[PDB]
Scaffold this active site. Sequence first.
Site, short mmCIF file in Angstrom:
data_model
loop_
_atom_site.label_atom_id
_atom_site.label_comp_id
_atom_site.label_asym_id
_atom_site.label_seq_id
_atom_site.Cartn_x
_atom_site.Cartn_y
_atom_site.Cartn_z
N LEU A 1 1.16 -1.05 0.06
CA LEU A 1 -0.11 -0.37 0.17
C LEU A 1 1.55 1.24 0.08
O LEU A 1 1.92 1.01 0.52
CB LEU A 1 -1.38 0.14 1.40
CG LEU A 1 -2.20 0.11 1.57
CD1 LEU A 1 -2.47 -0.06 0.19
CD2 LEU A 1 -3.27 -0.40 2.69
N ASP A 2 0.67 2.10 -0.55
CA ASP A 2 1.93 3.06 -1.26
C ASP A 2 1.39 3.87 0.32
O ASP A 2 0.35 3.91 1.28
CB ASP A 2 1.58 4.15 -2.86
CG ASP A 2 1.62 3.33 -3.67
OD1 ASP A 2 0.75 3.27 -4.48
OD2 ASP A 2 2.72 2.36 -3.38
N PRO A 3 2.80 4.87 0.93
CA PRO A 3 2.60 5.22 1.35
C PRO A 3 1.30 6.02 2.12
O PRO A 3 1.03 6.78 3.12
CB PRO A 3 3.83 6.22 1.36
CG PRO A 3 4.31 6.67 0.55
CD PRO A 3 3.81 4.82 -0.38
N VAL B 1 -1.13 5.43 1.08
CA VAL B 1 -2.88 5.02 1.31
C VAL B 1 -3.07 4.14 2.39
O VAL B 1 -2.17 4.08 2.98
CB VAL B 1 -2.28 4.17 0.05
CG1 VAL B 1 -4.10 3.55 -0.25
CG2 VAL B 1 -1.92 4.56 -0.72
#
Lengths: 329, 52, 73
Positions: A77-79, A81
């Site tokens: 999960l991107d930062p 997100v």
Amino acid sequence: EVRRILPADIKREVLIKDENAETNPDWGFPPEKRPIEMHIQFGVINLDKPPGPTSHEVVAWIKKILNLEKAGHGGTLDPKVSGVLPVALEKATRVVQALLPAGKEYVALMHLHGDVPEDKIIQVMKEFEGEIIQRPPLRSAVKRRLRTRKVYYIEVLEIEGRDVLFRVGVEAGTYIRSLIHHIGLALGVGAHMSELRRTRSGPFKEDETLITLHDLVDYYYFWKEDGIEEYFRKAIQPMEKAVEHLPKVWIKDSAVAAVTHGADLAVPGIAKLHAGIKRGDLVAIMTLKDELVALGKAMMTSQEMLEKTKGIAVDVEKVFMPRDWYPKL
Amino acid sequence: RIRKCPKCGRYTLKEVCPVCGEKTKVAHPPRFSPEDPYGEYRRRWKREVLGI
Amino acid sequence: MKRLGKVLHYAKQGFLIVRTNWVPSLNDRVVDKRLQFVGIVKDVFGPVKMPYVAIKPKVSNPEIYVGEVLYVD
Ligand SMILES: [Zn+2]
């Protein structure tokens, strides 16, 4: 049967190979029998990742707080997100293999760069449902070839100004950011993803088991300081949960003993299995008491496993169950 | 900013849920720092509510 | 040549968007019926059955080719 819902929502049929197979009540440790210590060893956290840190960073924090040796997450999960970030622990760490390729669901906010009539927004978004063409980002792969990916569904939730909130279900590898960017081109005015949150990752979703890092640490403290196990115990799901979306094969005790001792899953060792299994499919090898024994690759179809008399039904890739549960070769 | 309603978990951008009228909150959980300042304070009231 | 053109519009982000029932290739040359060459394909997306294509305009002034059929030689 339809690309309209997440595959995890599709129920499979249970084929019976051997109706009289029985299991020994003295062997094994079903979830409801595992001491808290053991529950953790074979556990997975359904973490609600906070926006800010990278997923790796989050895993690191958890390893430190719980004084763990191993842990891993099931889907980067991107930062910025937030959302479902299954975090497998210790001996269960590799169950992520079953999660990384699972279907995902997100709730995203798209910001249009121009004014477009709602009907056209809905119309064009419905067009991106199903098999679509989406080339990988600049960060991933050394071969930016365009491939296809499945968008199981797109549901617009609310529209405020140029902000469009929508829920989207997709197969692994689908970038929501690209999806929105493409929608922007399709609508001509352009758009970008302004916010993103994951609501489902494989069998993990936003329910009572979803917990934050704040809850995690506190429940931990309750167990460590006050000697209260109930809260920390519930903050950790048994590894079996991480495999709920996978097609299964339930095997006899002797087969469990064989597999936990290095053998592959023999066809005659199967008591019952899910239909629809195709050669090459990842399958969860289960005990007759529903304990996860191992993950493996199917060597034949369900129908072949059902009718065959011998050979290898499943090539074991990772064994989770310790040898002392279901003893002897 | 993405929000959701505590009851019926509907996702929306509106302060008040369109479905039940009950107030909504930012769907993202609060930021976390391993140092966890106020963790002691938080647990004090939390132990109370839970009965520990 | 390979047709399936007709520009829907000139996306604000700088690309000519065309709907088609076939999936072309990246960097493919795009021309009008007069073989004047408009630009090069820079992206393909949308449903595999009826995809969208983003032509990187390489002309002094695009926007004129909107509603105009485009081809790939
Ligand atoms: Zn509500």
